[PDB]
Paper text:
Interestingly, hybrids with the C3 linker (compound 4 hydrazones) showed more favourable enthalpic contributions and slightly higher affinity in comparison to compounds having the C2 linker (compound 3) when the same fragment was attached. We compared the ability to bind to [name] [name] against the ability to bind to the [name] domain of PSD-95, a therapeutically important target in neuronal diseases and cancer. We monitored the binding using chemical shift perturbations in the 1H–15N HSQC spectra of the [name] domain of PSD-95.
As a model β-strand mediated PPI, we use the GKAP/SHANK-PDZ50 which, plays a role in the organization of synaptic protein complexes and has been linked to several neuronal disorders. There are >250 [name] domains with several therapeutically relevant proteins known to exhibit their function through a [name] mediated interaction. Class I [name] domains bind to consensus sequences with a Thr/Ser in the -2 position from the C-terminus, with the C-terminus hydrophobic residue and free carboxylate being the main determinants of affinity.
Residue numbers in the entry: 651 to 681, 689 to 758
The structure:
Amino acid sequence: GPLGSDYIIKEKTVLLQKKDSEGFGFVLRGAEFTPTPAFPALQYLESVDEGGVAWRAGLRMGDFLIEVNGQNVVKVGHRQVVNMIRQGGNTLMVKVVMVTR
Ligand SMILES: CC(C)C[C@H](N)C(=O)O
């Protein structure tokens, strides 16, 4: 609008269940930190393997990572988030948000 940017925010929570001999099929990248509607989290999905576990569940390149296995990771550093994802083994529940600007 004339007073500022408008967005659509689409929240997606998915359960990823993978096999031992595969990844979840995404690459995390990291963008004090205060979240904003346009910029909701430090970590986001730089890429998602088409047809991989994450892709099939509905995750997409550009999604911002909000939660991992019930823990909010909006303000959490890259290495820490990766370690939290690995703690779950072959199971990962994540919440992401897709921002259209
Ligand atoms: C967050 C990362 C550890 C995910 C990893 N690249 C995978 O595809 O399983």
